[PDB]
Structures are given as structure tokens and as C-alpha cells.
RNA sequence: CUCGAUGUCGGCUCGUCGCAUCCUGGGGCUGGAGCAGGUCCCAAGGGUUGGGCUGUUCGCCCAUUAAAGCGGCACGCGAGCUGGGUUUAGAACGUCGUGAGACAGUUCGGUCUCUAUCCGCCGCGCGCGUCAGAAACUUGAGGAAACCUGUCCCUAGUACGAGAGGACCGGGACGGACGAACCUCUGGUGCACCAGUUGUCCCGCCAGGGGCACCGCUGGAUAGCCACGUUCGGUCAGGAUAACCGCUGAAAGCAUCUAAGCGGGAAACCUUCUCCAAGAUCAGGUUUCUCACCCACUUGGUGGGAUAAGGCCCCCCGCAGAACACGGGUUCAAUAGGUCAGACCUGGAAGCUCAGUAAUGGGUGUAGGGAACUGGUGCUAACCGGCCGAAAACUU
RNA sequence: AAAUUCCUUGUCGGGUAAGUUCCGACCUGCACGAAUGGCGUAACGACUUCUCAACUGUCUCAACCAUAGACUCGGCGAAA
RNA sequence: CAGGUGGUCAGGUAGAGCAUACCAAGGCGUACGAGAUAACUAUGGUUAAGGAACUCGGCAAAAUGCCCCCGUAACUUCGGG
């Protein structure tokens, strides 16, 4: 579960390496961002000379969380890191490739491009 | 056995263990002891599990009891007659008789003793 | 908080009469050929002669 | 519907009537429809 | 036994291999990608058995791309066609939680 | 034609549907019930059917209650509760002594389960009413779980009725509505109701057909 | 009014009320094509976010949202909390004053007592009543709680529009927040569980263990409790209506929703859902059980005694619980404990033996230990018992 | 624009997603200023103030455990 | 009466230590008790995910912590830091 004032590492190559969750979109007073929830975030640090600059307010989708998430079949998915990918307003990633494993929950939330370019989807 | 629900006797859990070990030792040494009724009820399953180790009688069971009681003489008495004399009885090694409450604090009193 | 006013006699007594001793249930026993009266929970001890009858 | 304590006919075809205890003006033009309140 | 073992019995599966925490297993899980119904392998060390029969779950961990991933499955989940033990592990805990802070050769489990 | 059964909560478990989805189920042994009485509008003023459930030793039932059972012509039971029906066509199917059982419910039907929720003792305002409590720090003096303010001031010089305060939780009659019946097995008189059911494992529950469907 | 004291702002916690309505709901008019709006009317059921700055209220800003409403209640709420500001005593700056000092000027520091008597409220009992005494199941007078909403898809790129843009009405899918129950899962906890381990002391020594060091620490951890978990709800349908829209229709040959009459009509109201409920003193209903004596007096709806049905106390307990109450059991007993067997937790005991110089490792051996969960078992305690507790009639 | 600036959250720049506080300046100093010292200053400070990392039940949002009380029983037995 | 009271002696193991942990000699269990899983208060402990979003303010807590060896900036009054 990711909430405001949570730092997530960026699992793409837009330049941002860490973003700070501003809001969890998806309703009034919504608290937590699980796998596949869309976040507005500020870029807290980026690679020097990168496309996305420090202090940028961006939209991101959470693609891996350290809190275990239930699938409907009773299984659970768990990663060692909280990671999001910066996306465009049409849910396509702003970057050109995704690093690290990605939760399968993005498939049924129509993040199909992200699924396509993820190294492998669980 | 079943952990105490509520505050443990004598304050802490460690004091609880000391109390149960000491009353089990006194019970095995004298055959019959008088204590407060709650202490007797707490002793009963603890003491009977000690007698069960004594009935099994192996060196491992000896060590198991000795892990709880520190008196070699009482552990020897346990495994030498208490266990063997209960060998043909399946549980219920002890008995609690409720006796008159003691003056000074009206603490309800009980006698706990081995069955025969 | 302090009492605003002293209770009346009636109110004090209404509360105070409820401070009474719980009555003990007593049953008759016959040990050593003689009759006595003991609480029911102490009947076992009374028959085993563990109760000082005074 | 114009809700005002002062209702008066606007054009010559504003019938000013009183229904259900309250006065109002009804007219062919619904913009002129107007009720006392 | 438990009172609900009679409810439990039909939902169980035989032919689930004996395996313990520290073992590396392949778990083949059925995955629905649209209307394809494919089989995805999950290769990882078993870090947990949390018992209970039909409600027994097991958690296996791997390192896919610089990121540790833990999958917890119900044993007797029909979403696993079968599990296979690729190597027997030799550990001295039951729940192997320390490996979630170990990466590389220092997160290795021996072969007995 | 609202149907109902008296049973025991035997605890929960999980099963898996045909869709390979886990389903948490409370299993309820809808042990056989006998009727023992029909409530009629012209003699009791309302339509209901008593149901008796649970084996009890006949020596354990006082003779005022055994007399009711024997006037019903059934062996004395442990629990007895009425299922309330609508106002017409009440007892065209329930006869005193008929043995109504778990498969009165069907697979995939929806039920309302009534039980006595688990006791919670004398509960504080956070546990009982979800009060936020107060801060754990920043000077807060011994009010960490205390309710806070309980009224206004001189107006009104009182605390309103229904103010949420500390008191006993639990042991309340609770109905959960529209629980799926995953499975009823007739072989042994148990229904597998999806979800949670109020009360103890072992407590008496009334399973009725869901009127909200 | 209060100076023989009515604690001042803001915040927190808990609310409650109004409607002058922010959203959601219903409408009229529009300079309403559609989408959006503007305005007015009705509508208070529910909802009405998290942050940055400031003591702040306020306000501005950030990111959202259906929306981020306005007010009252001693600018609600300090015998509920805070104490940042203000408003004691210290000190400094600016300014004023010869000075002592002063300043709705600033700055740093500086306080928060009380064991609840009464009403009130939240819970729980005891007594009596309820025209014999009881037990079970109940009716529901009357209450309480609850009442939120989004996005997307189809309808349909259709209606509308020159195009751009883009529906109503209907149907479906998935949510957010909130609430309730529950513990299967996940996760937390775990003070009589298991294991490892440091220091030390002890058990004569070795071995094996124990005490203490926060439960010494550390890794786990069944039960129970729980949320971060699971499930369900918030519905639909009626009735009477609001604004509003009408039908028929005069007074007033016409016309007009109205004067007679009849309709439609909203998250508001009443039913419906959930819960409480006959102290509902109008103390209810359906049943079932006992339904029986004995003595004496001033012979009385008289007192006692004894009882019945029944219940209470005592006892063994409980996932019921502050006490109490409630629930179960009390030998024609599985209630607790023990015990046996499982389940589960831990993770491979001790002893012996083998390898090693040894630290250690292997075999015996999925070991040993063990609480809560399940079943069996009549071994232990539920015993050889006390107390309450039943009817004039008379009128049709 | 200050322990001094009322207007005032002045203005510009920096820091933040957002900064009435903070830092750097501007000078329009209500009302700075040279031993009631002026301006700096390494070191020092349980001083005041602002930022960052780490860390965490401070918080989201609470849950559970033990102990001392609370509660029950027996004894003694106040107070405003 | 949990406060205060100058001076002397003050062992072992671990430890730098008169710290600390456990012990010796030597004392003591110190003067209401017995129960009981209520709320609540206090004192401690643990806590998923997040990590100052709390708040006037990171208040409190957590964290850091030892020995040895590397290595150590602006600035400096050349000592420091
Ligand atoms: Mg416990
Ligand atoms: Mg200890
Ligand atoms: Mg006018
Ligand atoms: Mg009308
Ligand atoms: Mg296991
Ligand atoms: Mg409880
Ligand atoms: Mg809160
Ligand atoms: Mg809190
Ligand atoms: Mg205090
Ligand atoms: Mg406190
Ligand atoms: Mg006065
Ligand atoms: Mg209005
Ligand atoms: Mg309009
Ligand atoms: Mg409202
Ligand atoms: Mg309503
Ligand atoms: Mg900040
Ligand atoms: Mg208000
Ligand atoms: Mg006020
Ligand atoms: Mg106010
Ligand atoms: Mg205040
Ligand atoms: Mg007050
Ligand atoms: Mg001067
Ligand atoms: Mg002044
Ligand atoms: Mg101040
Ligand atoms: Mg108080
Ligand atoms: Mg009613
Ligand atoms: Mg009333
Ligand atoms: Mg609840
Ligand atoms: Mg469980
Ligand atoms: Mg768990
Ligand atoms: Mg142990
Ligand atoms: Mg040794
Ligand atoms: Mg010692
Ligand atoms: Mg558990
Ligand atoms: Mg309706
Ligand atoms: Mg009822
Ligand atoms: Mg009645
Ligand atoms: Mg009872
Ligand atoms: Mg066993
Ligand atoms: Mg050798
Ligand atoms: Mg070995
Ligand atoms: Mg060996
Ligand atoms: Mg300043
Ligand atoms: Mg400024
Ligand atoms: Mg400055
Ligand atoms: Mg001078
Ligand atoms: Mg100076
Ligand atoms: Mg100093
Ligand atoms: Mg406690
Ligand atoms: Mg007392
Ligand atoms: Mg002293
Ligand atoms: Mg010391
Ligand atoms: Mg005590
Ligand atoms: Mg945490
Ligand atoms: Mg953590
Ligand atoms: Mg962090
Ligand atoms: Mg803040
Ligand atoms: Mg920070
Ligand atoms: Mg805040
Ligand atoms: Mg601090
Ligand atoms: Mg600390
Ligand atoms: Mg420095
Ligand atoms: Zn007109």
C-alpha cells in the first residue's frame, strides 16, 4: 500500500529515479495505492541531464509493491521494492522501457503497453 | 499447559513459574499441601504433567521434569515412587479439597494432594 | 469533583442499606456422630475432617 | 417561473389568477409565468 | 483432526510433492491472458509453509530482475497444475524470512 | 414463501469455485428441524412456523417445555425459534412435525444469516464506536483513548440521549444479508455459505432466504 | 446577571441543530441547438479530502474530488486534552519618557489542580409490579440505527449541430469512501510454546539444564484479540407529498391544475431492510406445566407450615463476563482438568554411536518439546444440599 | 523588511508539489548605526530559528501483550 | 515519609571502569492481602505497508552507540573544525 508522502523508485527510463506520491487518484479521500493504481507524484531526484527534471509533478502507476497483494485465486504477490512508472494521460509510459518485474494487475487495468515492455509480468 | 488467563500469580509470569515449581516440589515431597484455591487450581494440571513425565520414566523425561524442578531429592522421589505408584492410573493424579478461607485476607484456601 | 450538597437521610439510607453481607449457603453434616452446619462448598473437607468446627 | 412577492401582468395576455391559496400569472409566453412567493 | 475435515477432504489434491522451506521448486501456474490460458513457471526457493490442510499456503521467493519477488500460493490451489522440486534445501529454520534481506551468493541455500 | 432453517456455525474454511477462485465459506450445519407449531393469523394473529433444532437429552428439559413438545408430538429439542412468514398462504406446506433440512436451500441461492455476534465485554469508545481517540504524544495528558467532549455547554446543560459512550459490545442479534450458498451437501446436512457469519463457532444461527435476492 | 472568579484565541476529540444547499435528488425560465452552463424554486437523507505557509481564525497555494457549503450551540466542547497566540513575574530590539517605566510594536522563555454528590448520558444488575404460580415461543404501541457517491461500457459517435463538439432516457461492469459482522486467507500481536545465543550464578563435576539480565536478546509462532485481511450492506418496490407538470371544470356563455373532484411528482416524510421493544402500569398474545394440601385464630381475598411446577444459591466451567448478569455442565456426566490420539507451532531432543585434533557434523529419527483447535477416555473435581416459590369472589 | 519594518505574507531570487516561517538581496530605515559600541568572526551553546539524511506508532490508524491501578472479596478507613 | 545526610571499607566473573549484568561476604523479601484476561489511566514491549503525512515544533519515541584499522570538507584565531 502506497500513500501520500511515500517514495517509490521509478521502474522506467524517463530519468526520474525516485518520486513522492502526492495523491492516490481514484476517488475522494482514497488512501492506498496497490498494484496498478495511478498516482500523481513529484520527482524527488532524477539522473543528471535527464528528460524528467527534479521537482516535476508527474502521473505514475504503481507496478510493484512490498505489501503483499491478493489475487482472486487466493495467491499473493510481493516484491522487495515499491516502484512506479511515469505515464502519459493515456496510460502509456512516458519512458521507452520498464526495468524489473511487474505485477499482473496492470493487465486488467489497461496498462497494456507497460505490460508489453515489462521484462516479465507476474 | 493452558496459559493463565488474566494476571499471573504473584505478579509476573516468572514469579508464576517459580510458584508452580515450588508448590509442585512441596506437593511431591509432602503428598499434600495447603495453598490458596487459585494456586491449587493452577498447580493441578502443572503437577499432573510432571507426574506424567515421571510415569514415562525415561532419562529424557527425568531431564524434562528437572528442567522445571530443581530439587534432585524430590525429582528422585517423583520417578522412584510417585510415577510408579500412579503407573496404572490414566490422569487425575491430584485432588483439590476446598477448605475454609484464611483470616487476615479471607483468601479462599484449598488442599491439593495426590490421590492416594 | 466534590459533593454539591449533603445527601438527605433518605438518599443516604437508600444507598447504604444496599451494603450488606452475602449470605452463605449452609447445609447439615454429621461427622464423628455429631451434627453440624457448614457451607456447601466445604462439605468435602467437613467429611474428611479438615474443617475446624470450633 | 419568477417567484417574487410582487407579481403583475407583463403583456396583455398575462392572465393573473389565484390557485391553491396563492396568486400567480399564467401567460402564453412561459417566460412571463410568475408566482407570488 | 479438525471438525471441518469432511468439508476439507474433496477440495484437497494428491500428487502434490513433498517439499520443505529451503527447497527450490518450479510452480506452474495457469494464467489467463485474454482467452489463451497459458502456463507460467515460477522458479524459486520455498521460504514458508503455513500449514492447515486445504488452507495451507506456501511462499516461494526468487530474484527476477534485480528485484526479489515472493509468490504465496494455497497448496491444493487448482491454479497450480503441479509443483516440482528442482533441488532439496537444507535449512535450520521453518520460515526463512532472513533471505528477504539477502541478495546474491549470500542468499544461497545448500543442497541437502 | 420465505424459507428458513435453524443451524449451528461450525467455523470457516476456504474452497475453490469452478473459476479457480478462492471462496471463504462459513460452514453451517443446517441440522434437521421439526416444526412443532404453526402460527396462524386467526389464532395467533400472524403467520410463523416454529422450528426446533439441536439434540438435547429429554431429562434436561423442564416439563412445561416437554408438554409443548409432546402436544406437538415431537421429541424435545434444544433450540426453538419462529420463522416469520407473509400474511397469506402461510401453512399450506408446513405441517407440525415435518422434517425440514439443509437442501431446502439450493446451490447459488442467497441467504440472510442471523446470529448472536461474539461478546466483546465492556468496550471503550474507540473499539465500540470507532472514536479516533487522541494523540499519543505532543503533551496529551492521559486522554489517549478517552472520548473527548461529550456535549456542548450551558446550552444544552445536558448530554443528549444516544451519545456514543463506553459500554458492552457484542452479544447482539446480527443479520448479514445476501450471502451466497456455495454448496449444500445433503449427505451430511451442511451448507457452505460464502463469507462471514455472526457469532461463535458453535452458536445457533437462523439461515433464511434473502428477501433482497 | 456574574468581580466572597462565568478560564480567555486557535487546534484536538466528540458532537448536535438550522437551511440562507457545496454535492447528490426533483423542477420552472433561459440571451437552453447538443455538451456544458446562468438564474430561480423545492429539497437537510447522506456526503462534504489530504497536504504547504501561518499560533492562528481567516486566507492563499499544491494535489484531488460528486462536492471540497454557510451558520448556531458560553465565537459548542480545558472538573475531556493541548497551550502555539494573547494576557503576570526574566531578557532584548525599535520607539516614547530626565527617570522609575511604557507601547493592540516586535522577539526568546515562561502555567493547565480536583478520588463525580445530584441531574444528564453509556452500560449492567437487584426489587416489585403485570388479579394463581411458572416455562417456552412470541405480537409490536413506540423507538433507534442506517440513508454517500464515482468512472467506464452499451444504447450511440445515435439525437442535436454547418462543423467542431456531443446527449437525454434506459441497461451492464468495476470502483472510492463509510459501516457491520467475521478470522478462511494475508498481516499484527503473542510474558506457562519451540529454537538459537551473550554475560553470569547455580544444579558436586562432565554432559544436560535452570535463575537473572526488558519476555536478557534474536528467529519463528497455533489459539484468542485484531486490520492492513475476508465477507456483506448501503437496494428495490410501494404510500402520502414538495417545487413543478397536468385532466375534467365553473363562478365569469370564453378561459383558467381548483372553487367540487381526479392524476403525475424528489436522496426529504411514512412503509419496506436491520436492531431494541409489553415498566406498552393499555404491563399484550399462543401454548405448555403445577393446579396440591396441613394447622391455628378475632374464621378472615386470614395467617403460618409444608410444598408442586419452576427457580435461586452452592459446585465444574465458558470465546459470557468489571461485580452482577448470560450460557453450558453437574455421574442416566465428556463441563473443566488430566490422559490418549490427531491438528498445528517449532525444527531435528536427550542418550548412545560414528567422523573430526577440535570447533562441530552425521545416524538412531520428519526427531523431541508444546498452550488455546478436534475426537476418544469415567482418572480428578462437579458431592450424601439448602432457600424461595400456587387462585374469595362477584355482574350479564 | 533586521531579536529593529507599521504598511507587510513589501518586491525579486532560492529552497517546497505547494513556504505568512527560512536563506540571499533590493532600500521605500513607520522607528539601524559605531564602547546603552557598529559590522564581522573560527570555536563554543540542554539558546532561538530554517532545511536535509537516517530513524521511527508522531501520524495514516490503530492492534495486541505484560505489569501497577481500576473491578471483586476480606481488613483498616480518610477528604475537599 | 520513594526526599536530604559529611567521612571510612568495599570481594568475584565479564568490563576501561567505583558504569553495567550476574554473584561473594553480608543483608533483605520493608508491615494490607487474596483474586480477576472490563473500559480507562500509568509503566514497559511488539507491530504489516508507508516514514514527519503528526505537531506550534520530530514533543516523545526510534535511530546512532563499543574496540581496532582506514578515511575525513568548507572554514580557521592554525589550536581547531
Ligand atoms: Mg493470553
Ligand atoms: Mg525475566
Ligand atoms: Mg417587480
Ligand atoms: Mg399542488
Ligand atoms: Mg507446518
Ligand atoms: Mg472477553
Ligand atoms: Mg485520525
Ligand atoms: Mg491514534
Ligand atoms: Mg496527570
Ligand atoms: Mg500518556
Ligand atoms: Mg460563589
Ligand atoms: Mg430552501
Ligand atoms: Mg435549471
Ligand atoms: Mg447534510
Ligand atoms: Mg429517509
Ligand atoms: Mg516540511
Ligand atoms: Mg457545525
Ligand atoms: Mg468557544
Ligand atoms: Mg465554533
Ligand atoms: Mg480550547
Ligand atoms: Mg467544561
Ligand atoms: Mg532617551
Ligand atoms: Mg499592553
Ligand atoms: Mg511566547
Ligand atoms: Mg474522573
Ligand atoms: Mg412500530
Ligand atoms: Mg416509553
Ligand atoms: Mg466491528
Ligand atoms: Mg485460525
Ligand atoms: Mg496470519
Ligand atoms: Mg518452556
Ligand atoms: Mg557444562
Ligand atoms: Mg540468582
Ligand atoms: Mg492467528
Ligand atoms: Mg421511493
Ligand atoms: Mg424481537
Ligand atoms: Mg407477559
Ligand atoms: Mg447457571
Ligand atoms: Mg497431545
Ligand atoms: Mg572422535
Ligand atoms: Mg544430529
Ligand atoms: Mg552426536
Ligand atoms: Mg528573521
Ligand atoms: Mg517578507
Ligand atoms: Mg533575509
Ligand atoms: Mg554610545
Ligand atoms: Mg555587544
Ligand atoms: Mg554553558
Ligand atoms: Mg491489562
Ligand atoms: Mg473493601
Ligand atoms: Mg526514608
Ligand atoms: Mg551498579
Ligand atoms: Mg493484586
Ligand atoms: Mg510499522
Ligand atoms: Mg516494517
Ligand atoms: Mg524511509
Ligand atoms: Mg507538516
Ligand atoms: Mg524529512
Ligand atoms: Mg496537519
Ligand atoms: Mg527528543
Ligand atoms: Mg531511545
Ligand atoms: Mg560545523
Ligand atoms: Zn405574458
UniProtKB/Swiss-Prot annotation, chain A:
UniProt GO molecular function: large ribosomal subunit rRNA binding; structural constituent of ribosome
Subunit text: Part of the 50S ribosomal subunit. Forms a cluster with proteins L3 and L19. In the 70S ribosome, L14 and L19 interact and together make contacts with the 16S rRNA in bridges B5 and B8.
Key words of the record: Ribonucleoprotein, Ribosomal protein, RNA-binding, rRNA-binding
GO terms, biological process: translation
Pfam family, one: Ribosomal_L14
Species in which this protein is naturally found: Mycobacterium bovis (strain BCG / Pasteur 1173P2)
Keyword hit for RNA-binding: yes
The name this protein goes by in its record: Large ribosomal subunit protein uL14
GO cellular component, one term: cytosolic large ribosomal subunit
Swiss-Prot record, chain D:
InterPro entries reported for this sequence: Ribosomal_bL36, Ribosomal_bL36_sp
Keyword Ribonucleoprotein carried by entry: yes
Keyword Transport appears in the UniProt entry: no
NCBIfam families in the record: rpmJ_bact (TIGR01022)
GO terms for MF: structural constituent of ribosome
GO annotation (BP), single: translation
Domain of life: Bacteria
Protein family per UniProt: Belongs to the bacterial ribosomal protein bL36 family.
PANTHER family (alphabetical): 50S RIBOSOMAL PROTEIN L36, CHLOROPLASTIC (PTHR42888), LARGE RIBOSOMAL SUBUNIT PROTEIN BL36C (PTHR42888:SF1)
Keyword list, A-Z: Ribonucleoprotein, Ribosomal protein
Protein name as it appears in the record: Large ribosomal subunit protein bL36
Pfam family, any one: Ribosomal_L36
GO CC field: cytoplasm; ribonucleoprotein complex; ribosome
Organism classification: Bacteria, Bacillati, Actinomycetota, Actinomycetes, Mycobacteriales
UniProtKB/Swiss-Prot annotation, chain E:
Keywords: Ribonucleoprotein, Ribosomal protein
Lineage, uppermost ranks: Bacteria, Bacillati, Actinomycetota, Actinomycetes, Mycobacteriales
SUPFAM superfamilies for this protein: Translation proteins SH3-like domain
One GO molecular-function entry: structural constituent of ribosome
Name the UniProt record assigns to this protein: Large ribosomal subunit protein bL19
Protein task: This protein is located at the 30S-50S ribosomal subunit interface and may play a role in the structure and function of the aminoacyl-tRNA binding site.
InterPro entries: Ribosomal_bL19, Ribosomal_bL19_CS, Ribosomal_bL19_sf, Translation_prot_SH3-like_sf
Pfam entry (one): Ribosomal_L19
GO process terms (BP): translation
Family, as annotated: Belongs to the bacterial ribosomal protein bL19 family.
Domain of life: Bacteria
Record carries keyword Endoplasmic reticulum: no
Gene that specifies this protein: rplS
UniProtKB/Swiss-Prot annotation, chain F:
Matches recorded under SUPFAM superfamilies: Translation proteins (SSF50447)
InterPro entries attached to this UniProt entry: Ribosomal_uL3, Ribosomal_uL3_bac/org-type, Ribosomal_uL3_CS, Transl_B-barrel_sf
A single GO BP: translation
Gene Ontology cellular-component terms listed: cytosolic large ribosomal subunit
GO MF annotation list: rRNA binding; structural constituent of ribosome
Source organism superkingdom: Bacteria
Residue spans crossing the bilayer: none
UniProtKB keywords: Ribonucleoprotein, Ribosomal protein, RNA-binding, rRNA-binding
Family recorded in the similarity comment: Belongs to the universal ribosomal protein uL3 family.
Name of the protein in its database record: Large ribosomal subunit protein uL3
Organism: Mycobacterium bovis (strain BCG / Pasteur 1173P2)
Source lineage: Bacteria, Bacillati, Actinomycetota, Actinomycetes, Mycobacteriales
Amino acid at each position: 500500500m502506497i500513500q501520500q508522502e511515500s517514495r517509490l523508485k521509478v521502474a522506467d527510463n524517463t530519468g526520474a529515479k525516485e518520486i513522492l506520491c502526492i495523491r492516490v487518484l481514484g476517488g475522494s479521500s482514497r488512501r492506498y495505492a496497490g498494484i496498478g493504481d495511478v498516482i500523481v507524484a513529484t520527482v524527488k531526484d532524477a539522473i543528471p541531464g535527464g528528460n524528467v527534471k527534479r521537482g516535476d509533478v508527474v502521473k505514475a502507476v504503481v507496478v510493484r509493491t512490498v505489501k503483499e497483494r491478493r489475487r482472486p485465486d487466493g495467491s499473493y504477490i510481493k516484491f522487495d521494492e515499491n516502484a512506479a512508472v511515469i505515464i502519459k494521460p493515456d496510460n502509456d509510459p512516458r519512458g521507452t522501457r520498464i526495468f524489473g518485474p511487474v505485477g499482473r494487475e496492470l493487465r486488467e487495468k489497461r496498462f497494456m503497453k507497460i505490460i508489453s515492455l515489462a521484462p516479465e509480468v507476474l | 499447559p493452558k496459559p493463565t488467563k488474566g494476571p499471573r500469580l504473584g505478579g509476573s509470569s516468572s514469579h508464576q513459574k517459580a510458584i508452580l515449581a515450588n508448590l509442585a516440589t512441596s506437593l511431591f515431597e509432602h503428598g499434600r499441601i495447603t495453598t490458596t484455591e487459585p494456586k491449587a487450581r493452577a498447580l493441578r494440571p502443572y503437577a499432573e504433567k510432571l507426574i506424567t513425565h515421571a510415569k514415562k520414566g525415561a532419562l529424557h523425561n527425568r531431564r524434562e521434569v528437572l528442567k522445571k524442578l530443581r530439587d534432585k531429592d524430590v525429582v528422585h522421589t517423583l520417578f522412584a515412587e510417585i510415577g510408579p505408584f500412579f503407573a496404572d492410573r490414566d490422569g487425575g493424579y491430584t485432588r483439590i479439597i476446598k477448605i475454609e478461607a484464611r483470616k487476615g485476607d479471607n483468601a479462599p484456601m484449598a488442599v491439593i494432594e495426590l490421590v492416594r | 469533583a466534590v459533593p454539591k450538597r449533603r445527601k438527605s437521610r433518605s438518599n443516604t439510607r437508600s444507598r447504604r442499606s444496599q451494603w450488606k453481607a452475602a449470605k452463605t449457603e449452609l447445609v447439615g453434616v454429621t461427622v464423628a456422630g455429631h451434627a453440624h452446619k457448614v457451607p456447601r462448598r466445604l462439605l468435602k473437607a467437613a467429611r474428611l475432617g479438615l474443617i475446624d468446627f470450633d | 417561473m419568477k417567484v417574487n412577492p410582487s407579481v403583475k401582468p407583463i403583456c396583455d395576455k398575462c392572465r393573473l389568477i389565484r390557485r391553491h391559496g396563492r396568486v400567480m400569472v399564467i401567460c402564453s409566453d412561459p417566460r412571463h409565468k410568475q408566482r407570488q412567493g | 483432526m479438525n471438525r471441518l475435515d469432511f468439508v476439507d477432504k474433496p477440495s484437497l489434491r494428491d500428487d502434490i510433492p513433498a517439499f520443505n522451506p529451503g527447497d527450490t521448486i518450479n510452480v506452474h501456474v495457469k494464467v489467463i491472458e485474454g482467452a489463451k490460458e497459458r502456463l507460467q513457471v515460477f522458479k524459486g526457493v520455498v521460504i514458508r509453509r503455513q500449514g492447515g490442510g486445504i488452507r495451507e499456503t506456501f511462499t516461494v521467493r526468487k530474484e527476477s530482475y534485480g528485484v526479489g519477488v515472493e509468490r504465496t500460493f494455497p497448496v491444493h490451489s487448482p491454479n497450480i497444475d503441479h509443483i516440482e522440486v528442482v533441488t532439496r534445501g537444507d535449512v535450520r529454520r521453518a520460515k526463512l524470512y532472513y533471505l528477504r534481506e539477502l541478495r546474491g551468493k549470500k542468499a544461497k541455500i545448500k543442497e541437502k | 414463501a420465505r424459507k428458513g432453517i435453524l443451524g449451528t456455525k461450525l467455523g470457516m474454511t476456504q474452497v475453490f469455485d469452478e473459476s479457480n477462485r478462492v471462496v471463504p465459506v462459513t460452514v453451517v450445519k443446517a441440522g434437521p428441524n421439526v416444526v412443532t407449531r404453526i402460527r396462524t393469523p386467526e389464532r395467533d394473529g400472524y403467520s410463523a412456523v416454529q422450528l426446533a433444532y439441536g439434540e438435547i437429552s429429554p431429562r434436561k428439559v423442564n416439563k412445561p417445555l416437554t408438554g409443548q413438545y409432546t402436544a406437538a408430538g415431537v421429541n424435545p429439542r434444544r433450540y426453538l425459534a419462529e420463522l416469520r412468514l407473509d400474511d397469506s398462504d402461510a401453512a399450506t406446506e408446513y405441517q407440525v412435525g415435518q422434517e425440514l433440512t439443509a437442501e431446502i436451500f439450493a446451490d447459488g441461492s442467497y441467504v440472510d444469516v442471523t446470529g448472536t455476534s461474539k461478546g466483546k465485554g465492556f468496550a471503550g469508545t474507540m473499539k465500540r464506536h470507532g472514536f479516533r481517540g487522541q494523540g499519543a504524544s505532543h503533551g496529551a495528558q492521559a486522554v489517549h483513548r478517552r472520548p473527548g467532549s461529550i456535549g456542548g455547554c450551558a446550552t444544552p446543560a445536558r448530554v443528549f440521549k444516544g451519545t456514543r459512550m463506553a459500554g458492552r459490545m457484542g452479544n447482539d442479534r446480527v443479520t448479514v444479508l445476501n450471502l451466497l450458498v456455495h454448496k449444500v451437501d445433503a449427505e451430511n446436512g451442511v451448507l457452505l455459505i460464502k463469507g462471514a457469519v455472526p457469532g461463535r463457532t458453535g452458536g445457533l444461527v437462523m439461515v433464511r432466504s434473502a428477501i433482497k435476492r
